[PDB]
Design an enzyme around this catalytic site. Structure first.
Site, PDB file in Angstrom:
ATOM      1  N   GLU A 135       0.875  -1.160   0.000  1.00 10.47           N
ATOM      2  CA  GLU A 135       0.000   0.000   0.000  1.00 10.47           C
ATOM      3  C   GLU A 135       0.924   1.225   0.000  1.00 10.47           C
ATOM      4  OE1 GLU A 135      -2.983   1.954   3.327  1.00 10.47           O
ATOM      5  OE2 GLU A 135      -1.195   0.735   3.868  1.00 10.47           O
ATOM      6  N   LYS A 163     -10.202  -0.076   0.588  1.00  7.81           N
ATOM      7  CA  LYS A 163      -9.975  -0.345   2.034  1.00  7.81           C
ATOM      8  C   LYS A 163     -11.215  -0.047   2.907  1.00  7.81           C
ATOM      9  CE  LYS A 163      -6.622   0.465   5.590  1.00  7.81           C
ATOM     10  NZ  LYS A 163      -5.344   1.205   5.715  1.00  7.81           N
ATOM     11  N   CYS A 193      -3.521  -3.075   4.856  1.00 13.75           N
ATOM     12  CA  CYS A 193      -2.905  -2.546   6.090  1.00 13.75           C
ATOM     13  C   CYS A 193      -3.793  -2.762   7.318  1.00 13.75           C
ATOM     14  CB  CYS A 193      -2.332  -1.135   5.966  1.00 13.75           C
ATOM     15  SG  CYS A 193      -1.029  -0.672   7.088  1.00 13.75           S
TER      16      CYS A 193
HETATM   17 CL   LIG Z   1      -5.410   4.294   5.905  1.00 12.39          CL
END
Ligand SMILES: [Cl-]
Ligand SMILES: [Cl-]
Ligand SMILES: [Cl-]
Ligand SMILES: [Cl-]
Ligand SMILES: [Cl-]
Ligand SMILES: [Cl-]
Lengths: 340, 340, 340, 340, 340, 340
Positions: free
Chosen positions: A59, A134, A166
């Site tokens: 990312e 995300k 993440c």
């Molecule tokens: Cl983030």
């Protein structure tokens, strides 16, 4: 599920993860230049890794973190767009699939709502086959618009792939959701900054185990003016054992072969630690021996999930009693995040 | 949250976990004798650990595993019963709370349905304040009737405690459910047999981290005629870091002090890794910056939990496509477990 | 005493340590430029670490090691001086305290005696509140004038801080001296070159344990033309357990929260491993039971310290019998260091 | 300083350490029986370890911990006495030196003052050549009369040996005192109970490093009715690196060869980490370059040691301000230990 | 090649290794009793490990080490004999293959020449399918007659198995010899005494890697009057990664599934680390590019092996120059072993 | 054999290994420039490491990997040549020996046959005393002409040195061959790319142990456009224990002192793990006790080595049955490498 060679076979997907040095960028031109650096890297790596079928970047590897709001908006990408075309050409040339990061991706209401934080899966013909936004942005510091959906896509050699980003991975729920949709590999792309290094190394392994899934993690490295990123990109088996793991080094690479037939054989024939099966057939032996059918129990026995699903506002209220009621805390204030 | 002393303070709960050597027992008289050995052990331990407030024993520490069905039925306990009274007296004498294992506990329909696998929390006045029945028995080999509920109880010094058992802990959902109910300590009692040693050591730590909770694990040791149990009883901080951990040694003990004020301060003031808070306020920064309110998003974005909650049979069907349709597998048959 | 978040609370001091890449510098202008790089780094880090209260840089991070004597003399700093003002402004802007390195600091008799090797503690108002001159320079290779005193200063949120430098930390005596003066955090700033990597990682932890003190270590990284520095900056609890630790990576960062109330609660209520208390009350239980008072024994029972204090020349002579009589050794000669 | 063989040479001392299972004993007859078990063990071990020159047993290995005061007094040993004769005969028969534990040893004023906690070094002719009385008993739980002196004795092949006991080793001062007297091996005999396992493993290594000394540690194992002992007996090099280390297993053994010539060569020719030399010649390079003589500085620059030596009551008072004023704490009371 | 379940599939062999507590025995009757304990253990283990196809016991697990020569001769076994029949019945009952240890096995010239140290592989029908006599006895202490041959046998599910014993495994040559004969699993049975614990753990892994073979290690535990055995029984993948590993605990068990198809796929399609292939096709790319054929070079380029094969007396002489000329050393004499 | 100081003595050789950042070069001029960077590095390192006697650089440190064939041919070195003279001058100036890498070295038939991959050992007078050509090139990707011989050379202070390269070390045979020729230090220079990091760290240690030899490993770091190199340069004792080890950091350095007298004392007086001695005197105790002489057995009992030596084509055929018959595999094709 085997480590140490550069080859791959008809049964194995050759996965490479990259400890990509975090960029420190400010303009669209600099993003495009860096995108081309990534492309060059893919092509070169395939020269050394003839078994490579899937290459994974961190990312933020494309844009860096655009801390400045204006620069964030100015550099937010279209998908498909110029960056993705640059990546697609590398995937066709090196005959691999790839996972790349667009941070941001323009919101439908760009430039009046925050960009998404997005990942694409590009096949070896240059085609975008999965676009993941995300679901759990790394609040408070990072300001991306949250996405709302996971996806499973048929990948190289038929290997089922889901992508996550993440902060997402701190939350067991997402890893579950992907595996329950059929994911055989969950790819976690991250720019995971210090401090939480050991915790993140462990989380990936624990999630591989808990969801009987291959896991690949590509994490950024270096210092970018704000954060230092701790690397430890890794590929992990569905039995929880690390295949290979990078250190904290800039542009480290790891490479492992993940067997298609092994995961499918395991999910079929594993018993004691067939966690996906067992969650929805609880106490099967007991019920059999008690004269109550041979399926165990499927019903969700966890009030939290039930409340969350039926009344998210109640579940939110409940959690605010245990934590705090405002997103911010007066003991550690952050501009733009309210508290008290 | 501190390790290495034998004391405790008004802010800390002194927790002891025991690597209790697995019994190999056959009769009610032998169970009672062993129960008294456990009681003697509690009393002696308090002599050495003046800070002890909570003592934790492994699942099966009282009865061993009653592999023989008849012996299982003959030795299944009543709660409250003679065993629990023997434990209660030790708790009063040593002025500690304790977590003990009854395997089995008589089913409401005893002896015509399989016993539960149960844990009690006994306070320093001898009172049973929590009775937990295992929700996910270790099928296929173990035949306990599954329970259906988690609990949170106010423990020593006000520390909120939930109990879970062995196989339960492989499933992130249960750790979530307890923490979301307010648990500040999740106690995992187990007779966790080899093979899965490293995986279980890691799971506990990952769950402590993911749910911002203290975790205490008491695991059995030794060989009992069938299984060898791998110990590694541990106490773990809410930040994912081990306080102390046993090895595989018979009747090892670990002891750590867990701070009440530290967990409450963390759950209040932690931001980036306030996972309980953040799960139900997703993308708060993004929504603020996009002009959409200051609470983030609470709605559950994971289709698996939603389907599970609304239609468990559908979620079961879905998982059988990914794994197998029968509880048993013809490639590794087990008597009484059906397959094909 | 907790690890993994970027926040801090009224009870915790947010400490950041930096694996600062060792400079290779030659002039006063290049030092000033680098000083400004450090300042920029502080400011940027605070953007990512809103809980930061204390930032720590390695010994030599400002000047590098000035191997050339003339350059050493030409670049030796005044305290207060231009470098420290550059640091102070960063501390005010980022509202943090900081620990910076001046190597050298001009001797009172500059340029006719060797510079000191110095550390400052700068508060969040830009004020120098502690200036520490290294007591045990890394002889033979490094030629700093030795300092003669430790200090304890009230730091962020009242946390008591002592500073020490590199080679100092090999000597348990200094860690003792600081803790015995009341230090609650000992900050060890270093440019600790390979080879002794594992030994130094362990020493810091052992010293945290032995002196019931928080420890923060900032160590340099990279190769500077002479030495390669091994990083592993860390923050460590007063119970000897690492909070977070860097690897060998250039400009790694670690960050941990150290609780004020936890160390004070421990130093008050710890018993078996209250090492500071116990050293000066030896055998208290024994003396009580023998009818000899309830304070134990305070008297120093170690002839070495007694001789050292009363007759350092005798203690020196004694040690030369066990080691060698001259500072140099003919088997491994070094120019300017005498032997035989 | 080498690990993995069972031999020894004229240059190496063959050291064996024993993870001796802690006895649970009550009478003088049972002590004598156990003493003979130890003797039998020595003889058998030499059959397998032809290079054995020194065998080391844990503190309390002979008597166990006599928790009961009356039994403590009844079983306290004379040195020389029957136990030591039983040990001496094993040392002559197996042609080895040995380190054995008498807990208690009768006080000069027995039975009206608490016994000492004592270690003997017995040579291969059966002669007691060192008797060490523990200087820092493990208060509060353990009630031994404190000793007041360290010793260095010429051991097998001329290797200089000092003995210390358990709790002693938490205190860097004692390891210093022995090395400064010339000790080339410090033997730490212990019955070191959980919890503090990792801390004690690390302390031994750190002390080996800090004092440029071989270290041998024999620690007890098993559960004795009160405590569980964590083993990890070890031999460690003068460079801080472990030679061999046991786990937590009952009656584990480790064996390593420690070179006489290597430590003497190191203490003579080591420079950067010649810690014994460097402590008493601080800043030698700096002073040379500043025109001030070629010896560095010997003077003790640490006010704590100076105060301790000149005014132990003041040093005690100082520490009580930082910790507490009474040996006991009302938050964790212990009978016979006063508080408030 | 997967770890953590108790099942096995048509593709996997379920291997169990046992940390069998070393017996201390003296008569033929006591051996037979212990043999029956082993049999009982096999049967019980299969109850818990339904996937078990192969069970492995330590060298010496049946007899212990018969230190006394007369007892050695009196208890030396016939193969086939009573012990092996007792083992065979357990293998048929539990429907598994097994590896058992006969120490000694009668020499053809019994009782006038030293017994062999032998292992059998027994199939699930009770048939002895491999009998291996140790080629490198653990001299000097152990006095077995050396065997002279390795073997490869078709095992459970067609998995090719070779057996080796303890000291054998220190010698890379034997692991090579087995793999080069086609072994897909090398089973190393040992009573490997301390000291050399870490070295032996590493050797097994390195040998798995170097010879692209599964490795299973069953090592004894406990103290037997002479030696303490360090356990760490393990199963290791052909990629060098541990599947599962025991600690030092008495009667620990590990269990892993090793895939038939995975090793055969690897040996076929691995390139860079196909060590068996590459050893006999050196420099293939180079020769191709130099116009010299497409097979690389097969010729043995190592003078030591060539001399050893053609003139073992010369190779012996050569090694005596580098080491010593007599089997014994006057610096560490052993009765019956000559020196000087 | 000791770690942590910068000195060396008459008994110890001071060895430095370098984690040299892999060059990315294309011309002869750029090679020469880099060669001078290496020289500068040697000189600077000696300033910090006064005990340095031997400095070791990675395979490919001089040229990088010349992936392009034309550039490979254009930059192939003569030995002696300009590069080696540049290295020799650094060795004389810094008064050290050094190990440098020429990749390629011109073939006798240059430019019509592939270059060798070569290492030189240069003494402190600038003289080339060993030139080693890699026997097992890292096929398939790397195309060097294979060499055919190992060498032993008297090094600093008489320490016997053999050199080997990268892929060579996966093969136990080469480490054996060197030790059997008398090597006391085997230096493994490598540009060992990810993936196989943990396997290579372990191999070096296992080989040190198995061949009772010091081992020094210098491995490259960084990303070069194709590969990422994992560092972990190390020096390892003859007992298998690491002295010091780098991480993955660019231009890390490790330094250790290896004792001449210790290895010679070990090879003379070690018994149980005198592997070089024992391989050629198998079963000596057994033969003595059986009345058959006091030398044990020397004869090679491993059919693979015997076949390899007498009929390499047969040994090749045998291995092709177990692996594959062509150097290439159609499942993972590589241009220029044939398959099917
Ligand atoms: Cl983030
Ligand atoms: Cl269960
Ligand atoms: Cl210095
Ligand atoms: Cl004590
Ligand atoms: Cl043997
Ligand atoms: Cl190569």
């Amino acid at each position: 599920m085997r480590h140490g060679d550069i080859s791959s076979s008809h049964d194995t997907v050759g996965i490479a993860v990259v400890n990509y040095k975090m960029p420190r960028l400010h303009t669209k031109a600099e993003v495009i230049e860096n995108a081309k650096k990534i492309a060059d890297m893919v092509v070169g790596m395939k020269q050394g890794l003839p078994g490579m079928d899937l290459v994974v970047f961190p990312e933020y590897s494309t844009m860096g973190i655009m801390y400045d709001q204006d620069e964030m908006f100015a550099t937010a990408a279209s998908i498909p767009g110029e960056e993705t075309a640059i990546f697609a050409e590398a995937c066709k040339k090196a005959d691999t699939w790839g996972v790349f990061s667009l941070t941001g991706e323009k919101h439908e209401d760009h430039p009046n709502k925050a960009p998404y934080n997005t990942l694409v899966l590009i096949n070896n013909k240059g085609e975008i086959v999965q676009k993941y936004r995300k679901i759990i942005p790394w609040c408070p510091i990072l300001g991306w618009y949250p996405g709302d959906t996971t996806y499973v896509t048929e990948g190289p050699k038929g290997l089922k792939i889901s992508l996550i980003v993440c902060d997402d991975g701190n939350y067991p729920e997402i890893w579950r959701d992907c595996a329950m949709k059929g994911a055989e590999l969950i790819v976690r792309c991250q720019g995971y900054m210090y401090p939480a290094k050991e915790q993140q190394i462990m989380m990936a392994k624990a999630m591989a185990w808990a969801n009987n899934t291959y896991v690949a993690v590509a994490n950024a490295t270096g210092f970018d003016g704000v954060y230092s990123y701790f690397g430890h990109s890794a590929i992990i088996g569905f039995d929880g054992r690390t295949l290979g793991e990078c250190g904290t080094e800039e542009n480290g690479i790891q490479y492992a072969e993940v067997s298609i037939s092994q995961i499918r054989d395991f999910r079929k024939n594993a018993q004691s630690q067939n966690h996906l099966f067992k969650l929805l057939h609880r106490g099967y032996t007991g019920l059999i021996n008690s004269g109550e059918g041979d399926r165990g129990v499927a019903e969700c026995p966890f009030d939290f999930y039930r409340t969350w699903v039926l009344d998210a506002e109640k579940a939110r209220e409940n959690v605010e009693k245990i934590t705090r009621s405002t997103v911010g805390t007066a003991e550690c204030p952050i501009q733009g995040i309210p508290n008290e």
